[PDB]
Amino acid sequence: DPQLKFAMQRDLGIFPTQLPQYLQTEKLARTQAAAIEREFGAQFAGSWIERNEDGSFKLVAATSGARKSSTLGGVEVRNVRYSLKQLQSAMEQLDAGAGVQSWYVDPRSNAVVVKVDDGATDAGVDFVALSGADSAQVRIES
């Protein structure tokens, strides 16, 4: 009933085959969740799950630190620049001073993602600019 396959790529965006492993990773994150947080501390950028060209997913955890690696299992370490901490700050600002279709932190793109309506980036460029938010940690989307 390739309607499963077709549909899973159709709405879940994955394949009946490429599911288990994803979940296996789903499960690995939950767990090494408390650890990774502790291990990196407040350098701790944030953490997410990426895909491997081989079409497999992989849990990445990021540090606004420098430990180019770690001892945990299945956890890929990736040294970002800003830290979930610092990032939140901007978000205080992005709110302090608040087309802007909603802003918010996002560690995959190591910064606070500001969202605006096509034809609005001018809104944000502005918005963030009034917001007092250090642009290096901002990232207008549309």
Swiss-Prot record:
**Which residues make up the pro-peptide?**
1-142
Source species, domain of life: Bacteria
What protein family is recorded? Belongs to the peptidase S1 family.
Quote the protein name from its UniProt record: Alpha-lytic protease
Identify the species of origin: Lysobacter enzymogenes
Species lineage: Bacteria, Pseudomonadati, Pseudomonadota, Gammaproteobacteria, Lysobacterales
Stretch of the intact protein here: 38 to 191 of 397
